[PDB]
Write a structure and sequence with these properties.
The PDB classes it as transport protein. The protein is an alpha/beta fold. It is built from nine helices and 14 strands. The chain binds arginine and chloride ion (2 copies).
Amino acid sequence: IEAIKSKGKLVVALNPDFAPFEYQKVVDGKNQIVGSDIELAKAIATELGVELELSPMSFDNVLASVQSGKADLAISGVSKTDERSKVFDFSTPYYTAKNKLIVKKSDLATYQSVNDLAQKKVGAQKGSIQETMAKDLLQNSSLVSLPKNGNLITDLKSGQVDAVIFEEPVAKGFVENNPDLAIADLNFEKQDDSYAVAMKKDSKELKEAVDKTIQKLKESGELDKLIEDAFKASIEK
Ligand SMILES: NC(=[NH2+])NCCC[C@H](N)C(=O)O
Ligand SMILES: [Cl-]
Ligand SMILES: [Cl-]
């Protein structure tokens, strides 16, 4: 936190292809990075009395950038995991999600359970816990792991993959803008998937500032409003 205050800016790593949390929106003819995680980042920077600097990158590189010191925080829809918790400090959680499949709409009732994915092609984002889930459970499937979420959506449209695994709000956001797609019936037989801010190990005072901010936004209902606003603003008109 002292290094951050002294340098006058907070550098946040994120991958802006993940509405409602972070995404690109055309504003006045130019793409701008927006979303509920950007509003969370702004609140943290305000708490610390510093400027906010975004560092957009592929999701696969977000955590590594925090680990090496190239960014101060990852605020990028990052799930806590035991493996990650060994290497990173995490904030208190700020969102909890279920995993879903997005499919072509004619396939929404084909996929009920994981067994229905046998002999099918399933995509997930490279570096995500969804990619890990697919690798660990779907031995009878062909797995595609792509750096960019938009490219997973393109592959699902071209019928190059049969399904893509995404957390529910993100899946819903893509369906809003793609009426050729739908959320499948499938559920996974559920540990917690909770989003948190990642930071370097042993950053106690930075964690305090982040957690004070999350606590405030939760108790006021503001965080809920931010996610809803961002979801609405991600729908293309
Ligand atoms: N901005 C993004 N692309 N976020 C992807 C997050 C996926 C998942 N919650 C994870 O932490 O692995
Ligand atoms: Cl890609
Ligand atoms: Cl610290």
